[PDB]
Motif scaffolding. Structure first.
Motif, PDB file in Angstrom:
ATOM      1  N   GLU A 118      20.782 -31.895 -74.790  1.00 50.43           N
ATOM      2  CA  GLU A 118      20.841 -33.236 -74.217  1.00 50.43           C
ATOM      3  C   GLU A 118      19.467 -33.708 -73.757  1.00 50.43           C
ATOM      4  O   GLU A 118      19.099 -34.867 -73.981  1.00 50.43           O
ATOM      5  CB  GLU A 118      21.841 -33.265 -73.062  1.00 50.43           C
ATOM      6  CG  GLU A 118      23.218 -32.741 -73.435  1.00 50.43           C
ATOM      7  CD  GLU A 118      24.295 -33.181 -72.464  1.00 50.43           C
ATOM      8  OE1 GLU A 118      23.996 -34.005 -71.575  1.00 50.43           O
ATOM      9  OE2 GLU A 118      25.442 -32.702 -72.592  1.00 50.43           O
ATOM     10  N   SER A 121      17.611 -35.203 -76.620  1.00 49.11           N
ATOM     11  CA  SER A 121      18.050 -36.540 -77.002  1.00 49.11           C
ATOM     12  C   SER A 121      17.575 -37.596 -76.012  1.00 49.11           C
ATOM     13  O   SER A 121      17.315 -38.739 -76.404  1.00 49.11           O
ATOM     14  CB  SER A 121      19.574 -36.577 -77.126  1.00 49.11           C
ATOM     15  OG  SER A 121      20.028 -35.676 -78.122  1.00 49.11           O
ATOM     16  N   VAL A 122      17.455 -37.238 -74.732  1.00 47.43           N
ATOM     17  CA  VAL A 122      17.001 -38.200 -73.732  1.00 47.43           C
ATOM     18  C   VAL A 122      15.517 -38.498 -73.915  1.00 47.43           C
ATOM     19  O   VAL A 122      15.102 -39.662 -73.973  1.00 47.43           O
ATOM     20  CB  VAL A 122      17.301 -37.682 -72.314  1.00 47.43           C
ATOM     21  CG1 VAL A 122      16.666 -38.591 -71.269  1.00 47.43           C
ATOM     22  CG2 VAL A 122      18.802 -37.573 -72.094  1.00 47.43           C
ATOM     23  N   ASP A 125      14.632 -40.606 -76.863  1.00 48.76           N
ATOM     24  CA  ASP A 125      14.849 -42.026 -76.611  1.00 48.76           C
ATOM     25  C   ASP A 125      13.777 -42.591 -75.687  1.00 48.76           C
ATOM     26  O   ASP A 125      13.321 -43.723 -75.882  1.00 48.76           O
ATOM     27  CB  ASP A 125      16.245 -42.250 -76.027  1.00 48.76           C
ATOM     28  CG  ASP A 125      17.326 -42.243 -77.090  1.00 48.76           C
ATOM     29  OD1 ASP A 125      16.991 -42.023 -78.274  1.00 48.76           O
ATOM     30  OD2 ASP A 125      18.508 -42.459 -76.746  1.00 48.76           O
ATOM     31  N   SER A 140      20.467 -44.653 -78.198  1.00 51.67           N
ATOM     32  CA  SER A 140      20.964 -45.873 -77.571  1.00 51.67           C
ATOM     33  C   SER A 140      21.598 -46.796 -78.603  1.00 51.67           C
ATOM     34  O   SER A 140      22.605 -47.457 -78.322  1.00 51.67           O
ATOM     35  CB  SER A 140      19.827 -46.585 -76.837  1.00 51.67           C
ATOM     36  OG  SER A 140      20.002 -47.990 -76.867  1.00 51.67           O
TER      37      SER A 140
ATOM     38  N   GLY B  41      27.398 -34.463 -72.200  1.00 46.36           N
ATOM     39  CA  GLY B  41      26.862 -35.726 -71.738  1.00 46.36           C
ATOM     40  C   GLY B  41      26.512 -35.784 -70.269  1.00 46.36           C
ATOM     41  O   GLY B  41      26.189 -36.869 -69.770  1.00 46.36           O
ATOM     42  N   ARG B  44      22.518 -36.981 -69.663  1.00 49.62           N
ATOM     43  CA  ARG B  44      22.101 -38.364 -69.872  1.00 49.62           C
ATOM     44  C   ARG B  44      22.440 -39.236 -68.671  1.00 49.62           C
ATOM     45  O   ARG B  44      21.771 -40.248 -68.429  1.00 49.62           O
ATOM     46  CB  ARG B  44      22.748 -38.931 -71.136  1.00 49.62           C
ATOM     47  CG  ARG B  44      22.397 -40.387 -71.406  1.00 49.62           C
ATOM     48  CD  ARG B  44      22.817 -40.819 -72.801  1.00 49.62           C
ATOM     49  NE  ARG B  44      21.994 -40.205 -73.839  1.00 49.62           N
ATOM     50  CZ  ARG B  44      20.825 -40.688 -74.248  1.00 49.62           C
ATOM     51  NH1 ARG B  44      20.337 -41.794 -73.705  1.00 49.62           N
ATOM     52  NH2 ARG B  44      20.143 -40.065 -75.200  1.00 49.62           N
ATOM     53  N   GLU B  49      16.989 -43.613 -67.887  1.00 48.61           N
ATOM     54  CA  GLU B  49      17.086 -44.005 -69.286  1.00 48.61           C
ATOM     55  C   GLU B  49      15.736 -44.323 -69.917  1.00 48.61           C
ATOM     56  O   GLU B  49      15.674 -44.532 -71.133  1.00 48.61           O
ATOM     57  CB  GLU B  49      18.012 -45.217 -69.431  1.00 48.61           C
ATOM     58  CG  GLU B  49      19.439 -44.956 -68.984  1.00 48.61           C
ATOM     59  CD  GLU B  49      20.282 -46.213 -68.959  1.00 48.61           C
ATOM     60  OE1 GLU B  49      19.759 -47.275 -68.560  1.00 48.61           O
ATOM     61  OE2 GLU B  49      21.470 -46.139 -69.338  1.00 48.61           O
TER      62      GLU B  49
END
Ligand SMILES: N[C@@H](Cc1ccc(O)cc1)C(=O)O
Ligand SMILES: N[C@@H](Cc1ccc(O)cc1)C(=O)O
Lengths: 483, 485
Positions: A118, A121-122, A125, A140, B41, B44, B49
């Motif tokens: 994870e 993936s963060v 982005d 996203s 998840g 995240r 972000e």
């Protein structure tokens, strides 16, 4: 009795020992000759022929690292290293790799360490938004990013994914007709990937580039070759426009190339191994304009983003294309399973590196870090222009200046002059520069990128370049280079 | 003012912090649940972000490592980890990568760092001789060795070298007739390497093995499959016998397989990713007997030799076959100082030889042999405790420090398979230990692979106690109807 090889206290003791050893290295790296001066075969002479049967002390080992290993090092981290492309490191990148090595988890799947997946993936982005990539390349949106070791493995993945995408529609028997396209400024990474991926060696295309376009690939030249290949019964497959070529930091126009590729249903991979990181700065983002029309995009964060070797950032629009080609589960079935995005099954916790760099330095400082290198190169470019004996051979684009000394058939003589000139500079051990031969012209590459490099090192490099220029031209005879 | 990102004193200050942070991790790793218990998840949502515009302190990041990262880790280095094959680490191996990461050189060629190339050739000859490999695999003799990241990468290179060798003789257009051979127990490295290399998916062979042979590939069955492929107009190319399979740690007989492969001019790669390191001990060297007749041999030094992820050792008899397939020089210059990039996929090579060099020196051949022996002894003890409990059964012969077993019910197989599935997952969910499973010969069996560096005998006994207590719990309230679905 028997001490555990992973004893916490012994780990802490020797750990602090090597940290000081390395901090001393970064402090004293300037004293070493940049390009190693050992002779081939030096280390087998100095080391035993077999492994020791009894343990040796870390103190004894570290001493051999000082006397035997360091002499055999070409110091990529030295502030006076301007060769090839930067092995960009940092404190943050180092710690993230040691936390990765300390945890020592295997990212075979999400369950083997959910954070090892994870977090990747963060940060992909994060990095993608800093590059202002479209949402089609991000988790996203509809895309996805993966961390890989090198660019060649990344290109190999997108290539096989493109190969399987076409062969699954037309039949596997046509693998011998797929054509991979690139410019003659593209490096092994593409040709090597095509070789491994089964493409026929006679179907790799290194399209000629011209000085009139600073050796960037012309889409018009691309369409001519493709029509020649279609007339020969071949199938166009894969084009790899390069932003910041290795030889002269040439930039291929992505948008015109994508326009040609879509007409012939071709996969487009943007190769930005070195220069891509500079697109974090808005004034450099224009170099990857048109990436919105490509299929994948890759850059080596270890080349110009401080992570230390190695960390390749691959962004794709259709991660299913990778999974369809690289997964081993049956074709019908073909959380994120990153092992299906790349070659490596035993993935390393590489996201900590990129996570530490982005947090420790932030976007504002990272932009200025890259801008400081470009500015140091722009200063080195300004010094060359002020010395009438030198010549800028191609436009500087990202923190690298290509130049050559001019003599006071002529091209053959000039090439020999710069070869002898450059080699005498490198042989001093004070600085290190490599060259390239673009359009028949032998030219010297000055790639400012080493993290420890400051303006005094670039000025110091300029002084040596001038002093040796005074040396060879002061006693110049064209018969000394007419051989 | 802004400080240089590679400032020596800041490197020293933060470097000592991480060492203390990791030493504390190894000291307290037992307190975490082995298999991470976060939900997909989770990360995240706990992280921003976007990337921060301003810098954040190492003290802030480290705390986030504790509260955000470590919870999302499955502790391969926990002494109570007996799941997939081991992630073998050590202090000496960790320091090797630290020095490798510190110097941060690129082994693109010999000049880019002579020590990064020459040390690799020396230590591979060190490890090879420890494994009693014939001189045809050593730089002293005819062959050579290279350090790579993973076995699948090593198998891919070895496979492409076998591919180009054949297609260069008969023609590139016959790539659609080349066949890759393995057993139904071989790992996806062979299948994944075949896919990338351009081998047709319908030309991958997963030859069936039998419980009568402990699921080791039979050279007689391999020859049968070859004759069908030859009779069908296909080209046999590449067979990959495995010592220490991933599921039941099965072993394929190398000598008779190369005998079959020699008859049909096939490349033989000996896959010993996990069990390979054990052959530095003379009593285990017999497992790789017949490697003198193969073309290449690979093991994962990060699986069972204390380097750390990652470090794959590949020895080949003919390194030029690798160069001919992987070099980008024109084919007339490949047809003639080591250049290790032409032996693998990666151009930007990492200084991997430091890891292996530090482990070999810091511990020595004697201590290294005993390290592996302790893992096998602990596993054999775990096997003895299982035989003494009549409710359990050993499913396959134990070969290298991994035990396969299953809980027995008081077809029966579907029931016993569902029992062990429920039994296993109940044990793993406790977080006290972690063991994975495998379905071999239709039988669901639990895998106990002893390999974590921090694992001592008390942890193995502790895992047996947890297994016995749950066995008492499941069987004490057993009913056929609870598992017949
Ligand atoms: N392969 C690069 C050299 C390089 C590779 C990796 C690096 O991290 C840095 C430089 C070239 O040919 O120019
Ligand atoms: N591929 C292994 C996982 C693994 C990989 C590397 C290791 O070091 C350990 C385990 C398996 O599926 O069993």
């Amino acid at each position: 009795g028997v001490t555990n090889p992973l004893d916490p206290e012994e780990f802490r003791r020797q750990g602090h020992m090597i940290i000081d050893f390395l901090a001393d290295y970064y402090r004293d790296v300037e004293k070493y000759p940049v390009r190693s001066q050992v002779e081939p075969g030096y280390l087998r002479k100095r080391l035993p022929e077999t492994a020791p049967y009894n343990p040796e002390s870390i103190e004894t080992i570290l001493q051999d690292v000082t006397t035997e290993i360091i002499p055999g090092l070409t110091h990529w981290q030295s502030p006076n290293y301007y060769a090839y492309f930067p092995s960009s490191g940092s404190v943050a990148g180092f710690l993230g790799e040691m936390l990765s090595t300390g945890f020592n988890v295997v990212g075979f799947n999400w369950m083997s360490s959910p954070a090892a997946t994870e977090l990747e993936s963060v940060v992909m982005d994060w990095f993608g938004k800093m590059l202002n990539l479209p949402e089609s390349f991000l988790f996203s949106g509809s895309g996805g990013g993966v961390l890989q070791g090198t660019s060649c493995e990344a290109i190999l993945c997108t290539l096989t994914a493109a190969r399987d995408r076409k062969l699954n529609k037309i039949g596997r028997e046509h693998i011998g007709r797929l054509v991979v396209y690139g410019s003659d400024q593209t490096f092994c990474a593409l040709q090597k990937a095509a070789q491994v991926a089964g493409i026929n060696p006679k179907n790799f295309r290194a399209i000629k580039t011209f000085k009139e376009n600073s050796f960037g690939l012309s889409a018009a030249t691309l369409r001519e070759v493709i029509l020649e290949d279609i007339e020969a019964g071949l199938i166009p497959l894969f084009v790899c426009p390069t932003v910041g070529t290795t030889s002269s930091t040439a930039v291929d126009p992505i948008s015109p190339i994508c326009e040609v590729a879509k007409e012939y249903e071709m996969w487009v991979h943007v190769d930005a191994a070195y220069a891509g990181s500079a697109c974090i700065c808005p004034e450099f983002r224009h170099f990857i304009d048109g990436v919105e029309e490509a299929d994948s995009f890759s850059l080596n964060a270890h080349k110009w983003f401080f992570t230390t070797l190695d960390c390749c950032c691959l962004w794709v629009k259709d991660p299913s294309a990778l999974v369809k080609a690289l997964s081993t589960n049956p074709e019908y079935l073909r959380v994120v399973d990153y092992k299906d995005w790349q070659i490596a099954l035993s993935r390393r916790f590489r996201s900590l590196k990129l996570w530490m760099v982005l947090r420790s330095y932030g976007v504002t400082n990272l932009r200025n870090f890259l801008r400081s290198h470009v500015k140091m190169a722009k200063t080195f470019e300004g010094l060359i222009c002020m010395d009438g004996r030198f010549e800028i051979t191609v436009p500087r684009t990202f923190a690298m200046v290509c130049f050559r000394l001019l003599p006071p058939e002529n091209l053959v003589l000039a090439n020999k002059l710069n070869q002898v000139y450059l080699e005498t500079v490198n042989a001093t051990g004070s600085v290190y520069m490599t060259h390239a031969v673009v359009g028949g012209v032998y030219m010297i590459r000055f790639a400012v990128g080493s993290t420890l490099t400051e303006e005094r090192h670039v000025i110091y490099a300029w002084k040596i370049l001038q002093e040796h220029a005074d040396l060879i031209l002061g006693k110049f005879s064209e018969a000394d280079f007419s051989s």
